[PDB]
Design a protein around this nucleic acid. Structure first.
Lengths: 111, 57, 169, 158
RNA sequence: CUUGUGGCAGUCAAGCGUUCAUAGCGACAUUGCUUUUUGAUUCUUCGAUGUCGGCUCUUCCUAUCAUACCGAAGCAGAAUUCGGUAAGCGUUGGAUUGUUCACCCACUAAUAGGGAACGUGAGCUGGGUUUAGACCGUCGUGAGACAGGUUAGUUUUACCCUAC
RNA sequence: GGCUCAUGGAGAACAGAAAUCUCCAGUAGAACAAAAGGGUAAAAGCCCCCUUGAUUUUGAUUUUCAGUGUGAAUACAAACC
RNA sequence: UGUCCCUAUCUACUAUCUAGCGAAACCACAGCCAAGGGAACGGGCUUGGCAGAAUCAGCGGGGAAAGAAGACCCUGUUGAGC
RNA sequence: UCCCUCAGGAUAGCAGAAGCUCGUAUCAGUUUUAUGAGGUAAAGCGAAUGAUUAGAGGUUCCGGGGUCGAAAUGACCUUGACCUAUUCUCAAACUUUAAAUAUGUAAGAAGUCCUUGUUACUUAAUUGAACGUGGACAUUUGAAUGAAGAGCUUUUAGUGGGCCAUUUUUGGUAAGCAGAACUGGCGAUGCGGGAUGAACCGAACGUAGAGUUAAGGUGCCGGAAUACACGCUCAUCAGACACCACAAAAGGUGUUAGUUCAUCUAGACAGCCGGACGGUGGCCAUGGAAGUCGGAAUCCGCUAAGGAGUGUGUAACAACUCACCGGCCGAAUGAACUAGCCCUGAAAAUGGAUGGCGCUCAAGCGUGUUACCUAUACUCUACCGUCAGGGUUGAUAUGAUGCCCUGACGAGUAGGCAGGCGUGGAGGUCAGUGACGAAGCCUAGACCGUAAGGUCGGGUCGAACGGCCUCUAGUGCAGAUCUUGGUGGUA
């Protein structure tokens, strides 16, 4: 894996463009804040921006909001990875592991 | 001429469909428990049964 | 490359208030490297690891005067194939970082010493001339210096030329 | 041939301990075992009756039977792809209580005290445990702590 | 594949060589290279790849016996020895042996070592090996056994494709 | 139930390296039928007293394991000692 | 005494060409090499060298050529003579 | 696991199918917190067992003897037994200590707390023990994350030669050798890359489009910079990408960088040339040793300096000559090491392979930076199918096994199961087709179907044949050195 600290902007872009929910499993695109406040209105979240809030600021209903969200299906990055060989650790000149703030850049490219 | 023994693929085989817990019932196996504790325990439970059969009025 | 101030402390466990705040001058291409190297060096000096401590500050350091020509006397240690050896090299450059990446290149070129097998012990600018040891630097410290560039190889953007190209300058 | 005897491969484990030879200390016998009590299995080689197999050495089960000099323990024995219900008959020197279950059974009463208290007061209890949280924002003060500029060391023999 | 074993080749040099480590050799050690031995292995082949040696014939390897031209010497000459470039050039006739190996006689400038399915059986030969007959010795009560000895023992096909 | 073993030390006619006697040290360096390992110091060892639990009834349990057998072992229960 | 040094020459009948008559063995598809890797010795695969119809007489390098479910060795709970 | 078992079987496992009981459970090849167990890596031997090198000290009482007044339960020793404190190095079958990784258990309704009920068990007892009655605490249901549904059963296929790779590891000189441990792979697997390759790297596969990338590369073959940047290397045997198709010790004033010490206002190195001495025939060894047989001493004189002597020379001298300083010159040197790339070391057979070509401030080696090329991978979209969850003939005619909505998914040997295609017959039906042409065969003509196959046109031909719903089987061929018959190439 590659992981890091997801900024507000990058979280917003991900949940907008790649917002999919688990409803009777059947992975359903959100496309409407009615579909969020149907399933997650129980926990008080009534919107896309209310869901993005309960993620970006780790809420009392983080577990629920995060497990509701379907695993994001990202594509390969826009200009590539840089990195001639990926499967070294980021520190060495690879890509895998904890890239603190540089995940934001990667993820937007992969979006 | 052959080979003798290997534990290769034996984990994979086991984990594919298996490794499972024995389900743990309430009121467990009261067999191989102290025979004189059992001999008494019967009469205790029969006593409690009579006492609630008396209580039912 | 970049030069980074890295101040890490130690975990403040009460019975031990105010741990002694250890500062470094790490050479690294970003913060995620600069902080990993900080821990690498302080694990060779003190009983503390990233779990048992914390980075309290990381700050990029720039050049005081990034357009003054400087003679950087750099002390370095490197793992060779057979053993390890302490070296002193003299880079001439305009920044501390630019001098250091030239050292890393001329260490990789001359002793096959890659990034993992090099420690930058010190990068001190030489104050007064007549302290410059190495001739490959004392060359460029001569009064009223000039020198030509014979065999000037111009480069076409098209396969064919019509003139029989010259190498004059 | 090959050796698969009962006490085979058990040189070092049924070994007694350094300067802990000789007699068993009497607390071992005065200790009370009841059914449903979780107990460890660790043989005392000095005592060669009701001793467990080397498999069960290190295991933890729950007492099912209680008799004169001995208990009965239920242990989970994985064989191939499934656990079985293995009933041991152990003399009381080969077992001990598990502080595992002692620290839980006191946390139950600590939760019972916290809740029964905070039902009739200003409430912010949060009875569940939480793991090691990412440390909060602190200011580190450099008053007589002006950071020591460390440098890496030159190489030298010895 | 491997390189123990075999064969060849270094490094160090206590020393042998009047004196003198290294002209020529070299202890105690130690690093290799090779696949012309012998092993180790069992990967290919058991609806067969004709199983030793010789005869013939070509090509290649060089770890060079001679020849060409050189360097070194405990090289005066002659003679010899140690190397270099070097495989262009050649490197035999016989007695006994099936033998490969070996051993003698003799000439030669020299009678170097090897590979190419341990080259070469639709090229030969068939002495040896290893079918069936037979004799001897030792072993076995015996049938029989012997990588002990001895004698007699069928060597098939090209007109196909390629190569020449 | 009594005692302490190896070995060493200082000593008593014949008696000495070695026969018996006495004291001092002695964590086991002895001994426990054998192989080896573990265990054991008012004992599991050595000496002495009484016995026959090396018995009857069948079941459960552990190791090997298919959770079959065989062997060995464990812990009870009911009798009698 | 051509067994040989060391080969030569001759005769007949073949072969060869023609008219007539006219089979068989074998045949996955086939038919140029070098190295490479690969069931560790390729016609085909990879990389090179290369490569021009139709062919005739010879030849015995190769096609691990053909002949035959190895007869040697092992296995088989397959037999037989003795 | 068992078998006269080792080319085989039964057994359990892995597998498929049929389902079934219920509806997000208290499950998990996972972490955390708490609590066990371990004797392996490491370490240790001035800690036990065992091994093991070196002295010092005491030996005193004792095993070897006088050196000695014959003679000393004795002055000086070598001494063996030891003891003491030190010392060097070790252990698969030593060990005080003791990891990492793996591993047990717990983290709550079958829970906790407060009363009280029988009992032939146990208690001195009215004490307990097991199970309960009756109450009380459900927002935080008592760690994290996930959950694709969770549990249950029956039956039966194939298999039981395996092999490979990093890491741990036994035997062995070793092996593309033999045998283990954990995991991942091939088998059973295509695709992009390593030229080629079962196993390596990257990624696992319905049919297409578009976009982006992986590993790997971007002189030309060859899609893609004869890109940029700092260095190194010149080889009459260069080097060139992991597994992988090799090279070692030892050497080089080849060239680059580096480490330590020493010399410099005449260095000093150079690189030429003035002297190398008197006392003194320095002691002993001896015909002889006088500077050079050695045991060894080592001072001076004017001193610029010269060993009471570095090599030739002699029986022994003598002599020439080395340090040692100096007239000359004029601004860096003298070693001893260390590692980079080259070079020596470096020899096998057909001709020959960094994949080829070629490449020399590279198209080599080390390193950095962008750009760029492209996989059956990733994203979006279409269509096919499978599976899942739903909606709906509600008077609402046209299909409820129907139609339709939504979501995910698609590799495969051995093997299982399902849905179909085709053949000879059989029962029923289409009042089926047909001498104005059945069936058969031929067809670089057409249409349908993912496919098995179906349908049609044209020709030849001349007497039968078909669709559909069902029944039944001597029912589908490329292989069997298959059978019969026919035919070839060789020719």
């Amino acid at each position: 894996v590659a992981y890091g600290y997801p900024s507000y902007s990058t979280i917003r872009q991900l949940v907008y463009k790649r917002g999919f929910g688990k409803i009777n499993k059947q992975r359903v695109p959100l496309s409407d804040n009615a579909i969020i406040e149907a399933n997650l209105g129980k926990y008080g979240i009534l919107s896309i921006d209310d869901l993005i809030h309960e993620i970006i600021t780790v809420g009392p209903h983080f577990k629920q909001a995060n497990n509701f969200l379907w695993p994001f299906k990202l594509s390969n990055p826009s200009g590539g990875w840089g990195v001639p060989r990926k499967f070294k650790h980021f520190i060495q000149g690879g890509s895998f592991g904890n890239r603190e703030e540089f995940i934001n850049k990667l993820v937007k490219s992969m979006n | 001429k052959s080979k003798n023994h290997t534990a290769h693929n034996q984990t994979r085989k086991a984990h594919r469909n298996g490794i499972k817990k024995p389900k743990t019932y309430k009121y467990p196996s009261l067999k191989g428990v102290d025979p004189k504790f059992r001999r008494n325990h019967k009469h205790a439970l029969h006593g409690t049964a009579k006492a609630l059969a008396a209580a039912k009025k | 490359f970049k030069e980074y101030q890295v101040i890490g402390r130690r975990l403040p466990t009460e019975s031990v208030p105010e741990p002694k705040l250890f500062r470094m001058r790490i050479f690294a291409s970003n913060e995620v490297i600069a902080k990993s190297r900080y821990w690498y060096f302080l694990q060779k000096l003190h009983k503390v690891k990233k779990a048992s401590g914390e980075i309290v500050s990381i700050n990029q350091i720039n050049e005081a005067h990034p357009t003054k020509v400087k003679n950087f006397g750099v002390w370095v240690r490197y793992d060779s194939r057979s053993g390890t050896h302490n070296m002193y090299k003299e880079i001439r450059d305009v920044s501390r970082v630019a001098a250091v990446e030239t050292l890393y290149q001329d260490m990789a070129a001359r002793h096959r010493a890659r990034f993992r097998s090099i420690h930058i012990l010190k990068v001190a600018e030489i104050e007064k001339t007549a302290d410059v040891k190495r001739q490959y630097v004392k060359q460029f410290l001569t009064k009223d210096l000039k020198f030509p560039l014979p065999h000037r190889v111009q480069k076409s953007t098209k396969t064919f030329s019509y003139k029989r190209p010259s190498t004059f300058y | 041939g090959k050796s698969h005897g009962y006490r085979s491969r058990t040189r070092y484990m049924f070994q007694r301990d350094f300067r802990k030879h000789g007699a068993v200390h009497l607390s071992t016998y005065l200790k009370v075992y009841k059914v449903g009590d979780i107990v460890d299995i660790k043989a005392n080689g000095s005592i060669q009756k009701g001793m467990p197999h080397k498999f069960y050495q290190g295991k933890t089960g729950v007492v099912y039977n209680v008799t004169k000099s001995s208990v009965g323990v239920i242990i989970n024995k994985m064989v191939g792809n499934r656990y079985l219900e293995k009933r041991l008959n152990l003399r009381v020197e080969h077992i001990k209580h598990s502080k595992c279950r002692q620290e839980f059974l006191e946390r139950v009463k600590a939760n019972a005290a916290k809740r029964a208290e905070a039902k009739a007061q200003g409430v912010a209890v949060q009875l569940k445990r939480q793991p090691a949280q990412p440390r909060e924002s602190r200011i580190v003060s450099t008053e007589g702590n002006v950071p020591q500029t460390l440098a890496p060391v030159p190489y030298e023999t010895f």
